[PDB]
């Protein structure tokens, strides 16, 4: 059995605020599909800032690509020497039309409740 997948907004993982080898699930919008090297570069906006996450895909071929669309990625993170941070994909589904603010508020509320229950112990 594997470890569970905790949610993480793109900008935190972009800054490397998670330990190496952790399992995380995040979101973003695809920007490029490097065919030969099996690499995916998705992007997510934050005000005037744009953040990039590198996704290895060696475990989900065959895989259709939808340029300029949202995605959900779940897997493990490995801190490479030069490439930086890349997530090893285990499941990679596509969702469209789902509004970000509801999701962001949802994880914020869940984190708040978890911390509140953590105040008794």
């Amino acid at each position: 059995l594997p470890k569970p997948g905790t949610y993480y907004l793109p900008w935190e993982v972009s800054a490397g605020q998670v330990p190496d080898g952790s399992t995380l699930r995040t979101f973003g919008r695809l920007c490029l599909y490097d065919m030969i090297q099996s690499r995916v570069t998705l992007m997510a906006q934050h005000g005037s800032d744009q953040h990039q996450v590198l996704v290895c895909t060696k475990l989900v071929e065959p895989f259709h690509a939808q340029v300029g669309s949202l995605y959900i990625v779940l897997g493990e993170l490995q801190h490479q020497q030069d490439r930086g941070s890349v997530v090893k994909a285990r499941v990679l589904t596509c969702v469209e039309g789902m509004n970000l603010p509801l999701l962001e508020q949802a994880i914020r509320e869940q984190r708040l409740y978890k911390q509140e229950r953590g105040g008794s112990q």
């Binding site: 569970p4 499941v91 509320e109 869940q110 409740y113």
Partner: protein, 362 residues
Amino acid sequence: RCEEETPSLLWGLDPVFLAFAKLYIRDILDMKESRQVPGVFLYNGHPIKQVDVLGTVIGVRERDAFYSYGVDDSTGVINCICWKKLNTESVSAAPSAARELSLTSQLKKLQETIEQKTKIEIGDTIRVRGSIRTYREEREIHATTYYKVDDPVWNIQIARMLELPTIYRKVYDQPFHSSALEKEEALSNPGALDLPSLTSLLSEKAKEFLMENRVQSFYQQELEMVESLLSLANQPVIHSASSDQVNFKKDTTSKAIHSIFKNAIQLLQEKGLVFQKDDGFDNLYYVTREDKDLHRKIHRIIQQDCQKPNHMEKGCHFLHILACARLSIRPGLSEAVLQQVLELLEDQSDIVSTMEHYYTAF
């Protein structure tokens, strides 16, 4: 202190016992079991027998007769067990009329719809309903029912994981239920806390003591001189509420005891257990259960159909019976007393009730 789990004899009083609870998977992993009954689990005073989970499948394994599934709900992972229901003896159709052909076509459509709905692959969304079992020192979820959820936009999962904390904060993170009240077993000595409650409690005790002796005629002072009745009445609360006179503290306490005894007596009277007579005695009453002559009179009048004609429907209503009994014997007859008389007559297999408030003879 050793936290004692609630006794198994009161589990069902909770409304959660028969329901399908929604829990975080980490909670169901980390929440303890119960020693007195293995197979069921206890969480924060609320016993839980059935759970409901939803998430993304990340592990598939097949066996001879049962599947295997590893679900994830963003906080933990648990195994799932789904038995392969035997579709033995496949039904063979017959060349009946066109209606049966259409019905068989619809049956095939339903079968293929179910087969498509139950197909599961890695990366889908699964919903599971069932109980908890522990095998090989690990926790699993037996599945009573399960099906794939089609959510291409992530609406249902967002709604679920927004709704759940409200469910916790409103139901689960609360002390306990409210069943069998508290201290209602007896009254923690006859002292109690409410004087009307003390009178009410004295009422049935006096009634039972009168019943034990099979009393047919009694006087209020005869019941007041009873030491047990006084001891039941003499409570710390009644002494504080008996402050009406100072120069006659003993006399006013006796008056208060007389008042509470009379209140119990009139409470019994309102139940029809004891009636009243015009014999010049203020504190004289007779138990209606032992008035054999009255029972015989009512049985005779019911046999005669309460003066109603035979050619009409046999028997009479409660109101007409009450009027006939009042006019035939005593204008002072009370309606609860006649209800008790009719019930006692029915107890002795004297009459039969076709329906409510309508009794016939044989």
